[PDB]
Design a protein around this ligand. Structure first.
Ligand code: HEM
Ligand SMILES: CC(C)Cc1ccc([C@@H](C)C(=O)O)cc1
Length: 407
């Protein structure tokens, strides 16, 4: 078959579901770079993708991603009992109490940032979110962050994910940002271990610095650093979802009113933001043994990609996936495979995002502040979603004018 790396890169979110629609199937064989790849979409495909007797992650992460978005040696590249033991370290962080504490820190940081936004007169909303998130998550995680370094650290964390999937000199900045953030996080881990940094026993940095692997050994300092970044970085990336929350409030009639008046609505709304908007395009794994599924061959070693966006827009599951309708979540049965913006399956037994509770809690804070606290004007701008960008964003970045929180 032809190599279609370029076709995929031009339409990273929609390429798979578009081909699926043309072929009338939920799976097709393709090729990206050197590797024949089976592309999968939908609930049944997600269920097989998360079967760890048939799929492994070892060696599926590209070098370019190790050097930017994810780092080297982290939980994403692990399988089996080694993976599950490392995953438990992240899950232990996510108690209702700790998630609430992070949400509260983020509201405080958002409120702290508003006067700056007022004084600026006009802001790019997306651009302004990274720093308050950075401040909140570092405080929550037990990571010291001097006031005069917060801006710079926020830019470096942003560069790991916002510049990672950019085929421009921005990728070179992403690589440098990765080297810097690893060295910084490593100094944090070392200081905790030496006792020079007093992170509390409940905090992410403490848990990661003192984690013991399956042989009762501490993580090497570089791996501990990478895992700490695996908490800090994607929390800052919630800027993307917060921007989409603002976008939905601006472009979908009746949403603001429903959020204002109906109490149970916020939960439905943030879930629909995660379903509707493109963010994490797709996940990659490798077949661990020969098998056949739905008449498709999966030879041992075959690269397989699971299309998250397409799955979240599958008409078989949702009926009218093209509409933004929070109400649809009244009928959801909490299935582990049919709604997968942050992965599918089980959080402990597979690679599903442990950050979901944090994401939901922070999106709820954002929705609350944007409807009940913030006042802002939205000038004429290009609000259309850039499906060519990784991560996707409204083309304008969501521009606000005359922002205040006292009214
Ligand atoms: C900002 C929005 C976020 C999105 C769209 C997102 C999405 C995802 C996806 C799709 C995966 C991969 C699932 C798989 O490989 O099968 C993942 C994994 C992961 N996420 Fe998130 N996530 C977000 C936020 C967060 C947050 C706030 C945290 C903080 C702890 C986090 C931590 C992780 C970690 C450590 C993994 C690797 C888990 C593993 O491999 O077992 N994520 N996420
Ligand atoms: C770089 C591409 C693959 C898109 C992308 C994936 C994940 C994130 C967040 C959730 C993160 O993990 O930091 C941000 C962007």
């Amino acid at each position: 078959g032809p190599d279609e790396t370029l076709s995929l890169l031009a339409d990273p979110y929609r390429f798979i579901s578009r081909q699926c629609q043309r072929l009338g199937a939920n799976a097709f064989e393709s090729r990206f770079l050197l590797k024949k790849t089976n592309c999968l979409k939908g609930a049944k495909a997600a269920e097989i993708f998360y079967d760890t007797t048939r799929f492994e992650r070892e060696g599926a992460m590209p070098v370019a991603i190790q050097k930017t978005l994810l780092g080297q040696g982290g939980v994403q590249g692990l399988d089996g009992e080694t993976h599950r033991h490392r995953k438990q370290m992240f899950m232990g962080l996510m108690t209702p109490e700790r998630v609430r504490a992070l949400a509260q820190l983020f509201e405080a940081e958002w409120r702290r940032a508003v006067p700056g936004w007022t004084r600026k007169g006009e802001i790019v909303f997306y651009d302004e979110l990274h720093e308050p998130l950075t401040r909140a998550v570092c405080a929550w995680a037990g990571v010291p962050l001097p006031d005069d370094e917060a801006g710079n650290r926020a830019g470096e964390l942003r560069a790991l994910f916002d510049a990672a999937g950019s085929a421009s000199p921005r990728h070179l900045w992403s690589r440098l940002a990765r080297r810097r953030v690893d060295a910084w996080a490593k100094r944090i881990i070392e200081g905790i271990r030496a006792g020079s940094i007093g992170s509390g026993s409940g905090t992410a940095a403490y848990a990661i610095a003192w984690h013991r692997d399956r042989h009762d050994d501490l993580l090497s300092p570089h791996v501990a650093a990478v895992e700490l970044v695996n908490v800090l970085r994607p929390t800052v990336a919630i800027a993307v979802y917060i921007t989409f929350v603002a976008h939905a409030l601006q472009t979908c009639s009746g949403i603001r009113a429903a959020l204002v008046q109906q109490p149970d609505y916020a939960e439905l709304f943030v879930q629909e933001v995660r379903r509707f908007y493109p963010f994490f395009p797709a996940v990659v794994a490798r077949a661990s043994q020969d098998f056949e599924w739905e008449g498709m061959a999966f030879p041992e070693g075959r690269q397989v990609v699971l299309d998250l966006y397409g799955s979240n827009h599958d008409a078989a599951t949702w009926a009218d996936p093209q509409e933004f309708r929070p109400e649809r979540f009244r009928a959801w049965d909490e299935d582990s495979f049919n709604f997968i913006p942050q992965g599918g399956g089980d959080h402990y037994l597979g690679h599903r995002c442990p950050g979901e509770w944090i994401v939901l809690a922070i999106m709820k804070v954002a929705a609350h502040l944007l409807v009940n606290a913030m006042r802002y004007d939205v000038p004429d701008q290009d609000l259309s979603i850039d499906f060519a960008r990784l991560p996707a964003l409204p083309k304008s970045g969501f521009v606000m004018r005359n922002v205040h929180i006292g009214g």
